[PDB]
Amino acid sequence: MTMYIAFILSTIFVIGFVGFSSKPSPIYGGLGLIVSGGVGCGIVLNFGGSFLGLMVFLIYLGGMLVVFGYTTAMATEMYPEVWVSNKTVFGAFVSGLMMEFCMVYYALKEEEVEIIFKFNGLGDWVIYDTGDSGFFSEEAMGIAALYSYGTWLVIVTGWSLLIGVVVIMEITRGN
């Protein structure tokens, strides 16, 4: 049902998170990350972070795009791996999908839980708050404050990208 739709969207985020963390062929992991990234956009989009969801979507597609180019450039093998072919990644795959299965069952069955922290499974819909935003979106207006309140953050971030191009040329210079 759509009532625990966020419960679902959270899950396939981690099944995709598991799939690429099982270290399959590099581009296959790229697919495993993007499905998680795509559904990961859904979770934060559900909570109201429309801009945050779109940006984590947009640039991570750009981030994963450049990853694929390098994988087939100098990081691919003449006999590529698959999630099933190698038993090691197969073992990593199967371990991941039962790890969530046994746990989300336990969390949903008892709804109190103990592991690391205490978790009331109940429903993520509960903690939404009776608030009105007026004629402005908080998720977008707060980010807009970066250029009026976060001048130091802009300076440190902007500076860092500049060396980011310096290092990306410094270490690739090849003598």
Ligand X SMILES: CCCCCCCCCCCCCCCCCC(=O)OC[C@H](COP(=O)([O-])OCC(O)COP(=O)([O-])OC[C@@H](COC(=O)CCCCCCCCCCCCCCCCC)OC(=O)CCCCCCCCCCCCCCCCC)OC(=O)CCCCCCCCCCCCCCCCC
d(Cα 128, Cα 153) in Å, to the nearest integer? 30
85 and 92 Cβ atoms separated by less than 8 Å:
no
* Residue 83 contacts ligand X per CB under 6 A: yes
Nearest of 29, 52, 33 to residue 42 by alpha carbon: 52
* Residue 28 contacts ligand X per CB under 6 A: yes
* Residue 93 contacts other proteins per CB under 8 A: no
Long-range contacts of 119-124 (CB under 8 A, 24+ apart): 123/3, 123/4, 123/7, 124/4, 124/6, 124/7
* Residue 114 contacts other proteins per CB under 8 A: no
Name which of 29 and 49 has its Cβ closer to ligand X: 29
| Residue whose entry in the numeric block shows the structure tokens 């990208």 | 161
Q: How many other C-beta atoms can be found within 10 angstroms of the C-beta atom of residue 146?
A: 12
d(Cα 43, Cα 84) in Å, to the nearest integer? 29
State the binding string over 41-80 for other proteins (x if CB under 8 A, else -).
--xx--xxxxxx-xxxxxxxxxx-xxxxxxxxxxxxxxxx
Residue from 84, 103, 122, 144 touching ligand X (CB under 6 A): that is: 84
- For ligand X (CB under 6 A), the number of binding residues is 6
* Residue 32 contacts ligand X per CB under 6 A: yes
* Residue 106 contacts other proteins per CB under 8 A: no
User: Which amino acid belongs to residue 115?
Assistant: I
Minimum CB distance to ligand X, residue 82 (Å): 5
Residue from 54, 61, 75, 82 touching ligand X (CB under 6 A): that is: 82
Q: How many other C-beta atoms can be found within 10 angstroms of the C-beta atom of residue 66?
A: 9
State the binding string over 8-27 for ligand X (x if CB under 6 A, else -).
-----------x--------
Residues of this chain that interact with ligand X (CB under 6 A) are 19, 28, 32, 82-84
